[model samples]
Target chain A: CPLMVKVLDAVRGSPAINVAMHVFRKAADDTWEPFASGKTSESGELHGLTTEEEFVEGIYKVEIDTKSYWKALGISPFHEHAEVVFTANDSGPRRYTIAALLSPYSYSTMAVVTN
Target chain B: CPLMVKVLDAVRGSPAINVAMHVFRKAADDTWEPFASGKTSESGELHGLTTEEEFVEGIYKVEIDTKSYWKALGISPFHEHAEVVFTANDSGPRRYTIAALLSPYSYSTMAVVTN
Candidate 1:
């Protein structure tokens, strides 16, 4: 099964930074469905076993709402939230590794494909 | 010189569902800044010339705020918005093409790498 680990960043010291990770899956024809759910860690990672189960192989799209979270913090990051597209074709064989991390500037999704 | 095009989908018949896309960039060490920005069209998409500019080579992170936009309509999606991390290297050569579409359920990002 496919899986993904994501990093979330909010205004450091902002209250919205405490928001939980909300996950949704859009169907092929045009219907959004709620699947897995999670929240970021003190280190800003929205990864856990919950996300792993819902992350089946194939194609999936994700979005994050940093605006309301930031607003909840008493200020706006002015940085509109962002999203990305990719396929999770199941964790590869040969003990491949896929870990996620975030700094104030950027986050990464790096994986090694092993056959 | 990397480029991307994405399809967006929201409530087919809601007003606030039409939110302009906002863009921002985070530096490597841990500082966020606005790099590029755009909004979706009558079709709920956030694509166009604006995004292709800031899409340089390397990695990037994105988020989207779908809460407030929907809440304005007096409804809740319960979906806590999400985010994704990926690398947006420069546009490959030899006529590689990448276009995006959305049906209500899913979205995609595809590319052909050429040397």
Candidate 2:
């Protein structure tokens, strides 16, 4: 997989399960175009969002529906959504793992990139 | 003071210094209105962004200029910026500390709320 995601529930200290997400790539015109979408698995991970050849150099956005995730658990959350926007493959092809920790009123997201 | 921010550089494993940030509160019409702004100090912290009296129940966005911070370090970064959006004070007035870990390609932000 060219990209993967791992989500955690900070309050419960466990992997976030079934969290919905969408991916978008910025077009040359600067408009966001849909690229991929999926939900986290039982382990709070989603992989194979894109292929190495398809995930070329460009800007991309990974949006997590944090609100819905929390509301499903009967908790009210703060953000409308959690998004990470970044440029990818600028230098070369690399594997990426985005790790996010979530709370009802807060979240933390980090990326681990490797060759 | 009601809100605080702490930033850490994941790559360097130290406090991120001199990172600029802005705060915005969503308005009645869903527009974001500027609330506060400041830069992280040498200790990667900023306090007194808002007073207890002013930080009522609402949604807020904290935007950090991560690109500029990385550029200043002579490194090319992937993110346009790093932002955290959340609801605040829905239950009651509480102290909040937003801790963010940053890298050239990723960031993680978590909140600690207390009475």
Candidate 3:
């Protein structure tokens, strides 16, 4: 599992944004486990993660680097960036998708996991 | 036209995902420009950027690096990652919001620009 980030401006000009995503898993006793890490493409995209391994139905967590990314723009975060907690049913071996988007100071997350 | 990245976990385990996003805009009539830059935060988030400066209004494009990020999780991209095209109206000085959420391989974005 990994975190997603999307940056957009309210103008017609081009804006550069650095996005870094991180994935984590819930420990057996209530914690987190590092899963994967990567950066989005030059076109503001970070795709393709471990999908074949398959997950066991349960709770999960995701985190993003909002401060660093927005800082490049000389802007500050509104709420320390953003965070999301969700649960998925990996009972069966299948494929799932998840993503998110963000601005210099603001951002949003989604649990759009589908098979 | 900066890019945003968000990562979500499939199972309860805290999966880690490395995300990198970039922003671009349609220059003059055809081309792209880099504006701001940043990544998601530790909790799958990234905050702070130059928001004081306003932008015009028009069409723009954004690209994402799906191959590298997903590859870390031992997964392959499905369509070279995801991309988005949009325009913002920086008429006055307003705060616009843009963000996204992503899983190991899949992700999504939103242009929640508002004052």
Better of 1 and 3 by DockQ: 1
Q: Best lDDT goes to which candidate?
A: 2
Which has the better DockQ: candidate 1, or candidate 2? 2
List of clashing residue pairs for candidate 2 = A78-B87, A108-B109, A109-B107, A109-B108
i-RMS, every candidate? 10.6, 2.3, 8.4
Candidate 2 residue lDDT tens string, A23-115: 999999988899999999999999889999999999998999999999999987767788898888888998989888888866777788899
True contacts kept of 3: 0.00
Q: Write the per-residue lDDT of candidate 3 for residues A5-111, one digit (tens) a residue.
A: 34343222222245666767787888788766566565555556445544565565556666666667677756554566666564654334444445554454434
Q: Ranking by lDDT, best first?
A: 2, 3, 1
Kindly report which residue stretches of model 1 are placed more than 4 angstroms away from their true locations once superposed.
Answer: A1-115, B1-17, B49-53, B94-115
TM-score of each: 0.37, 0.78, 0.44
DockQ of each: 0.07, 0.50, 0.04
Say which candidate scores most in TM-score: 2
In angstroms, the error of model 3 at B8 is: 18
Better by TM-score, candidate 3 or 2: 2
Q: What is the C-alpha lDDT of each candidate?
A: 0.41, 0.88, 0.52
When sorted by DockQ, best at the front, the candidate numbers are 2, 1, 3
